[model samples]
Target chain A: LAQLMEHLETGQYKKREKTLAYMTKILEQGIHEYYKSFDNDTARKMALDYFKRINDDKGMIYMVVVDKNGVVLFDPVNPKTVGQSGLDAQSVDGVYYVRGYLEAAKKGGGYTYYKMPKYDGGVPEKKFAYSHYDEVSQMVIAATSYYTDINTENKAIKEGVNKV
Target chain B: LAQLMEHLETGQYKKREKTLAYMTKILEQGIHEYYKSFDNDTARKMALDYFKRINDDKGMIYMVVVDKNGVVLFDPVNPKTVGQSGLDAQSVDGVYYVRGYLEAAKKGGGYTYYKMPKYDGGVPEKKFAYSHYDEVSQMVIAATSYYTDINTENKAIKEGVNKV
Candidate 1:
């Protein structure tokens, strides 16, 4: 990460790209899945709605929806395979045991924490947390995301999207 | 307004309609002549986004969208006419004047008070106040109608929506 910044400062675009790629790979392994088990459609809708609301407030916040059996149902960024099994996929980096942590969380209390990538894109954010009981949708949904950076510039995590 | 509310509680639907009509007329005139405006489309979306966030924290809440002219645009109760022009028609009743009040609020910070009328399909919740603000859409160059009364509940007025 430090190398990437230093390279960018010195106009080392190639070096920055190489370092960022390596950083992205290393960080992907440390992924920590925050959701446990969503029960219904309301829970899923509530979670999705909350995600959209937060997206509007900050910027393009990333989100993913998983079924009870550890299958990916929705992902805002990576829409490659919506119904694929996330259980075998790489765990989010930085968490102790991603699957175990999410399993326990599925028993149901909401939680929040500051997550920074182990490499680049390592900015910490303040994320509020919640869960919903959506019987109609048959999903035990969990919703969580960052509102802002509490450090120096008070940066809210938002990707610039020109919306009217 | 209070007198109209008293009549409404007593099943005076006709009187209620008359009151709304009077207020609507005044709103249109003001909007056509004096009310400062913003992007109504962006404002409604922003306000709804904020309301959903608060509901996730608590339970359910009510919201209304009006321009600085008290013209009704998109309403959570009936969001059909989200981009209609009310400046040239009537009285300041909906969130439009509330939008105007929100602008003035930026300077001195005063709260506007009004009784929310209960609708047949409404959330049957008691709404003490409906807060609002002015929002401008850069993409479409439109105006917004936000109520600040909703801000008091979460106490996250400016903190709720961050513009990029």
Candidate 2:
């Protein structure tokens, strides 16, 4: 049962990776469209409005903009982070999630995983993010989702595992 | 002019990454469909048939199947490699491109680049590949394209750079 649960966990994360990859492409393309016709300031302003308008609060899938250096630009979940550098920040898992994201962005795009201990959900609060580097803004545009948000199987499995 | 050319190159690659990501998602879901209803042998046979029917050659986008250990399971471009390990193989860049792809696949999916000096042509034959690890197949399903195959700007830019 444990092995089966682990299998399901991996499956869930893989699906989330694809979901975020798709989301980042939307962000990547949207920003590129703005950048193609406008200067940097105008492009960013327009793209931020677009990002904010589509901000998915209920889903907990945070839409984020961070340059390659890890300076947060637009973050709906944590607005105070907008001007902060998260380059050295570590999540509960002690992984440099943002740093890994920047590296992934440099390689075109990739996946990231980190735990959030204080997120205080009965479910695993670990997070998964995928990021794509945009040429126009020279930044990483990413979307992150809580594990529970994307995994229905997890709820059933967790209860069973507890009974076990 | 050099900076502009480099910028164009980056833009071209970013587009290719998204293209391959979209393609990999198709393969991932296709295999998942087979796995849901069949045993291992039946699932693989059915998925391989699906892959072959859709194997793209005219576009020079090679459909590939390799496990996380770099063992090739299917290769339309080189049938001889169907059972060989590429974990240690190095392209012209002296990098373990397949190894990186394996890691990328393990992380859901990601991009890889490698040079091919012997793939002689007036243009660079460097290849770019994207891979996704299929939960059903327990292997990486990938597609690769030559840099020229995806970058039309390269042809014009290379010619102009030559004239300079």
Candidate 3:
């Protein structure tokens, strides 16, 4: 996620904002196309199928789909998340990540950061999730990555450079 | 980016590929939006602001923007890059990372890993750059993070898990 944010830091404000806005639009386009011609189940299946294909080819990213009310519709990381209320969950940092995700999605989609359990079995680590609201599907879909490893380096760089 | 890719090695094929594609889409959306509705100057400004905001807030994460022909448009770490042909540059590891960036951008945007100089003025370190092709602006925008610090952990994990 920081990778995407890097473009925004170069002192170009409006240009970057437009870029971000356009990005949101293109992302929404994918969901719109899928949900436009299919029913909920079919749309979900297609999403799952496509998602599954990429995950099979490469495994670092994970995804989840939720309703406007914050109920999980699909979660590749934790299947038990299906049909559950993600809004009620809190990260170790006390952030209501799901609530934040829904709020961002409501705003036409944005990024949200929080902490969550690592798949590798350790304390929860910081995670970044970008959520997109699918109007046609009435679902908020998110793509997330566990960023602790990168954060470790980021923290070191920040401190090393600042002499903190 | 190794952090993002760590999950992909768990032997879960379909699960991993889905995550990768979704992550790629989310990333591409940012560039697509930035490139969609603005002229060159305005777009550059927005990118600078956002990247600045994050780095200022956390002191980590840097950005670089390049045109389709491999011209470096913006680079926070090395302002000298702004008007250079990055395509001709090579990483310390003998990798023509900029050329690889152009190649990946041509393929509809992708990830390129290599080694490069660090911000703290030391020997070169491993780096991961995620690039997206902006169709409208004809630019390849990228967000990169240095990862040598955590590479030790990654190396251990890979060795422990893979018996290599």
Candidate 4:
């Protein structure tokens, strides 16, 4: 099973990466649409409201919005994380992954791979995330999803390809 | 199964790490025994001879030896890796893991985590290695095994703990 996962992990990541790219692009467009017709606070809230509705649409994939200063603006998974400095969030092994995410966002966005405690009592494991920098809103719109949550679904979908 | 792997990865790493600590300690003692009775070059050759016999004992777990300068003095799995600079070895994502391993060895040893392609045509996955600095030979002796190589054995042993 682990070998099967090793094979599927690469394909799964590619799908997630494209999903994040599309989702962040849409979020950026929404923010731009609202920002042009209203003030910063109003535009932010309206765009966030739209994204939150879609955030519930599934598979543990989440959208996280951060300001230029690395402060979380929106996070559905952990509401308390909003207003916190993402720049200070490091992995168990001392990787400043959030800082890497925000920096990548500044450079037109890219993927940042980190490990985090995805389960309450579980150890840190890989987390691959992608972020998009929105110029008008000056926010980094990032998308992420968990493993395990989709493994069963993937296995069901790819049973035919598991020759080994 | 991936979730199980995520949970088991920590426990497996802990066990592998301790085993390495014990194995390297024994190797260091053997090197010291030979060095006291022979010249530096002859002692090194003798120590290598002893280690090779034991490297074939069992399990995918293998020993690797590197000098202080980070060149690979010995590698059981990849004999071709011998004589290469370990410092130049990096993960798919550009982590200088061999450098990290050597640095940790200099300070008496610790674990270094990185990702590498363990299977052909497969994605890079996590690798956790432990190294000990042998004073007599001035070598870093490390131990490592693969995830899939032992997963079946682990599952057979750990079936009792998979209640959740």
DockQ of each: 0.03, 0.02, 0.03, 0.01
* lDDT of candidate 2 over B59-163, digit per residue (tens): 435566888789878765556667899887776678786787798888878878876532223334688788888776787887776776655424543344334
Docking class of 1: incorrect
**DockQ, cand. 3:** 0.03
Docking level for model 2: incorrect
Best-to-worst order by DockQ is 3, 1, 2, 4
Per-residue accuracy of model 3 over A58-148 as CA lDDT, tens digit each? 3344566688999977755556767899888776799887898898888877777787765424577666677878666677877665554
- Winner on TM-score (2 vs 3): 2
What are the per-residue Cα lDDT tens digits for candidate 2 across A35-128? 6556788767766665664453243356667887899888655566678898877766688877988988888888788775322243337777
Candidate 3 runs further than 4 Å off: A1-164, B1-24, B31-38, B53-62, B149-164
Cα error, candidate 2, residue B36 (Å): 45
Residue-level lDDT of model 1, residues A36-64, one tens digit each, is 22334433443455443333343212333
Clashes of 3: 39
**What tens digits encode model 4's per-residue C-alpha lDDT throughout B28-144?**
543564565458887677666655644554444555688888888876654666788878876677887678778888788987777655433557666667887877788887766
TM-score for chain A in each prediction: 0.40, 0.76, 0.64, 0.77
What is the C-alpha local distance difference test score of each model? 0.33, 0.64, 0.56, 0.63
